[PDB]
Write a protein that binds this ligand. Structure first.
Ligand SMILES: [Zn+2]
Ligand SMILES: [Zn+2]
Length: 272
């Protein structure tokens, strides 16, 4: 038990999944902090040193971290692994990033089983001395993720199909919405400096009326003002905040990936 194998992840969701697989035999840290916007994060000098100190770096890919490839050029002799390997992307549907991969694949718990497996494989490959702890922890954690499907679907079962409209700020929920049969509407398709600020807002304001959508949400790393505006101009309640791009702090309401999925579905469900 020397100085432990060190994993650095780009953001907090991957950190929590990886730490569950690592147990107490490796130390997993995230470059971005709870609450920080992850798509256009601006790495600092202290971030370079942190990643350079790792034995393995994990990132999402599907161009989630617009900053990572240029950042990784400053890191030497540290293997990196894309934790979405083998996941089939849903494309972004509108806007300046139309046709790019929607990167938010972790919002489907069935996809999370593929995250777990890619992370297990990377740990076992680069830290073979603990292969049996990683393999044990991954199978146990995968069983915890599979056990969410029944309570999640039951939590959402009072909403008839025609009324399953999920109206959010970032279009970050496409994978969750596909899993549980929701139609998505969003104020912007992916986080970015972008045009389309008020024109989508009133296209959304329109969609709310033809379908009498009762609730609209925001997300924890972006501003709630557009969602709150859309709630006032319609008769819809502001239901947010939903969690997708970041966990909370350790003492907050969403300290783990499991708590993130559960609370997001629970908050959707109470909005209806
Ligand atoms: Zn490798
Ligand atoms: Zn996002």
């Amino acid at each position: 038990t020397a100085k432990k194998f060190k994993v650095v992840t780009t953001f907090t969701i991957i950190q929590d999944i990886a730490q569950n697989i690592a147990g107490d035999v490796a130390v997993v840290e995230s470059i971005t902090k709870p609450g920080a916007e992850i798509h256009d994060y601006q790495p600092t000098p202290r971030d370079i040193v942190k990643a350079q100190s790792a034995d393995l770096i994990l990132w999402n890919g599907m161009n989630l971290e617009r900053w990572f490839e240029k950042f990784f050029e400053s890191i030497k002799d540290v293997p990196s692994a894309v934790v979405t390997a083998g996941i089939t992307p849903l494309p972004i549907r509108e806007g300046p990033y139309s046709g790019i991969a929607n990167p938010h694949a972790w919002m489907s718990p069935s996809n999370a089983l593929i995250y777990i497996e890619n992370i297990r494989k990377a740990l076992v490959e680069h830290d073979p001395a603990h292969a049996e702890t990683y393999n044990r922890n991954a199978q146990a954690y995968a069983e915890k993720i599979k056990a969410l499907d029944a309570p999640l679907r039951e939590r959402l079962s009072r909403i008839p199909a025609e009324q399953r409209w999920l109206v959010t700020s970032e279009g970050a929920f496409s994978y969750l919405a596909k899993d549980y049969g929701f139609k998505e509407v969003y104020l912007w398709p992916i986080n970015a400096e972008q045009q389309g600020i008020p024109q989508q807002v009133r296209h959304v304001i329109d969609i709310i009326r033809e379908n009498k959508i009762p609730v609209v949400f925001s997300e924890s790393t972006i501003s709630d003002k557009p969602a709150k505006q859309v709630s006032k101009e319609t008769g819809a309640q502001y239901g947010g905040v939903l969690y997708v791009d970041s966990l909370s702090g350790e003492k907050g309401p969403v300290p783990t990936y499991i708590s993130l999925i559960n609370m997001t579905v629970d908050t959707i469900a109470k909005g209806f």
